[PDB]
Amino acid sequence: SNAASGGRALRVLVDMDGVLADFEGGFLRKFRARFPDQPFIALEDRRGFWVSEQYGRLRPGLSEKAISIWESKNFFFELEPLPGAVEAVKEMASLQNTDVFICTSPIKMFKYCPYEKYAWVEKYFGPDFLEQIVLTRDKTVVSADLLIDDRPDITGAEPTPSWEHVLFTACHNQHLQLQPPRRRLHSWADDWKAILDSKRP
Amino acid sequence: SNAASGGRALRVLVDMDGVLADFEGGFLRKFRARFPDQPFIALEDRRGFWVSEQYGRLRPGLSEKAISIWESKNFFFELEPLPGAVEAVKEMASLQNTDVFICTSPIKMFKYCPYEKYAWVEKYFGPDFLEQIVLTRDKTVVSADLLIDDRPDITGAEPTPSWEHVLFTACHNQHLQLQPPRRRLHSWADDWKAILDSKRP
Numbered sequence: 001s002n003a004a005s006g007g008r009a010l011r012v013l014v015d016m017d018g019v020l021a022d023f024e025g026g027f028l029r030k031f032r033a034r035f036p037d038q039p040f041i042a043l044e045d046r047r048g049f050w051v052s053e054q055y056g057r058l059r060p061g062l063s064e065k066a067i068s069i070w071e072s073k074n075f076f077f078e079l080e081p082l083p084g085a086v087e088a089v090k091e092m093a094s095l096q097n098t099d100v101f102i103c104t105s106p107i108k109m110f111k112y113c114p115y116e117k118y119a120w121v122e123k124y125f126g127p128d129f130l131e132q133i134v135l136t137r138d139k140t141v142v143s144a145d146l147l148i149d150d151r152p153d154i155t156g157a158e159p160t161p162s163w164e165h166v167l168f169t170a171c172h173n174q175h176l177q178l179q180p181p182r183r184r185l186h187s188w189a190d191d192w193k194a195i196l197d198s199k200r201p
Numbered sequence: 202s203n204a205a206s207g208g209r210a211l212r213v214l215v216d217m218d219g220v221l222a223d224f225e226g227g228f229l230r231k232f233r234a235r236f237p238d239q240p241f242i243a244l245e246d247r248r249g250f251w252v253s254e255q256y257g258r259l260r261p262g263l264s265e266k267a268i269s270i271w272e273s274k275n276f277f278f279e280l281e282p283l284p285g286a287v288e289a290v291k292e293m294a295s296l297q298n299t300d301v302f303i304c305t306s307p308i309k310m311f312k313y314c315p316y317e318k319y320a321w322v323e324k325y326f327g328p329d330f331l332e333q334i335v336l337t338r339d340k341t342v343v344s345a346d347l348l349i350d351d352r353p354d355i356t357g358a359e360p361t362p363s364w365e366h367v368l369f370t371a372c373h374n375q376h377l378q379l380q381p382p383r384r385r386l387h388s389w390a391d392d393w394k395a396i397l398d399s400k401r402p
């Protein structure tokens with residue numbers, strides 16, 4: 001909930017794909033359904049942020065096939081929420097002196113993805129939560145205390161972002177050793193309130 | 202153009218409706234075409250940021266009719282650029298040590314508006330400029346040196362935005378007296394480079 005008059009709430013940016021929405025699992029399911037005669041990458045074996053790059057190494061032309069899954073209509077809309085994600089973000093947004101924004105990057109093909117992200121947020125959080133969406137390819141120009149995001153290296157036009165990036169664990173990043181004092185949120189079952197509280201005055 | 206390694210470019214946020222895209226003129230044209238037996242507000246007579254509020258005072262039910270224009274498919278996509286806007290922003294983005302983002306708020310009805318804004322940017326600035334779009338209802342959480350925007354009072358979760366708001370003149374705000382030392386950009390013919398240069402190191 002917002003701070004009082006001209007006051008300062010803790011501001012938390014919550015990533016969408018890989019934090020609220022199960023992009024990796026949705027992708028694998030739809031990939032295997034559309035391309036049942038192609039090899040695929042089990043989630044346990046995922047390495048590196050870019051799915052299409054790993055697929056492109058697995059067999060020639062598979063990068064383009066992988067891309068065609070997330071460029072398809074309904075791919076973003078039909079992603080399942082991560083366990084505990086909707087409940088956690090609902091709770092977080094209800095906390096005193098705490099402003100929550102969903103900060104997400106659309107893919108390059110924009111026919112469906114922006115629309116479907118808004119629709120997904122409306123579905124799981126309600127119409128009033130649409131006010132909290134920030135769509136950007138550059139998260140470094142969004143100011144906050146925290147950014148909870150599964151991408152390991154978040155860069156852009158601002159060399160010194162105001163937020164601390166807490167890495168949200170995903171299949172593609174779970175083995176990564178981070179430079180101290182970078183921190184993780186291992187899942188929504190993990191103690192996200194303690195992370196927030198560490199940044200409060 | 203971006204700064205060098207970990208370096209700091211001047212960052213300018215450029216609003217879309219009323220700065221790049223002619224929302225007021227597009228609205229009036231389509232309103233009069235769809236509702237030719239209703240009274241309307243000439244641009245010269247526009248007062249206050251919210252078109253639907255002024256229309257709602259003009260005759261009962263006209264607020265809802267006004268809203269139905271911008272909720273229609275193709276309304277955002279078909280807006281004409283303001284004179285000099287595309288040329289100015291192209292030039293600005295080519296300047297050394299200058300990063301330009303288009304920072305725009307979607308309407309509440311999201312079926313068409315986000316998509317059409319991306320499509321409009323692609324049309325006038327090209328595919329590579331899509332990287333520069335930030336869609337948000339709260340501009341105060343986007344950090345920059347300048348925000349060029351026709352809305353007079355830009356507020357949100359950050360009580361002390363990093364940007365200076367330069368008011369871009371529009372029909373609805375042209376008579377407004379601003380509190381010193383608030384500044385205007387009167388049109389894209391006006392000297393926007395001098396405004397940028399005033400914020401450089």
Ligand SMILES: Cc1cn([C@H]2C[C@H]3O[C@](c4ccc([N+](=O)[O-])cc4)(P(=O)(O)O)OC[C@H]3O2)c(=O)[nH]c1=O
Pocket residue numbers: 017018023049050051052070105106107108109136137138
């Ligand atoms: C969020 C996410 C997306 N992707 C896919 C989806 C698609 O996204 C992009 C992509 C690239 C850059 C950024 N960005 O730096 O903001 C977002 C998405 P696209 O190039 O926009 O299609 O990169 C290639 C593809 O990679 C992934 O492979 N893994 C992810 O975790």
Ligand SMILES: Cc1cn([C@H]2C[C@H]3O[C@](c4ccc([N+](=O)[O-])cc4)(P(=O)(O)O)OC[C@H]3O2)c(=O)[nH]c1=O
Pocket residue numbers: 218219224250251252253271306307308309310337338339
């Ligand atoms: C940009 C702009 C939009 N409108 C219209 C369009 C529609 O926008 C909103 C609107 C409201 C708030 C914000 N915002 O504070 O980010 C954006 C758009 P909607 O409520 O989202 O439909 O307000 C009512 C309508 O008012 C205007 O009347 N004038 C404008 O300059």
Ligand SMILES: [Mg+2]
Pocket residue numbers: 015016017018019149150151
């Ligand atoms: Mg992510």
Ligand SMILES: [Mg+2]
Pocket residue numbers: 216217218219220350351352
């Ligand atoms: Mg505007």
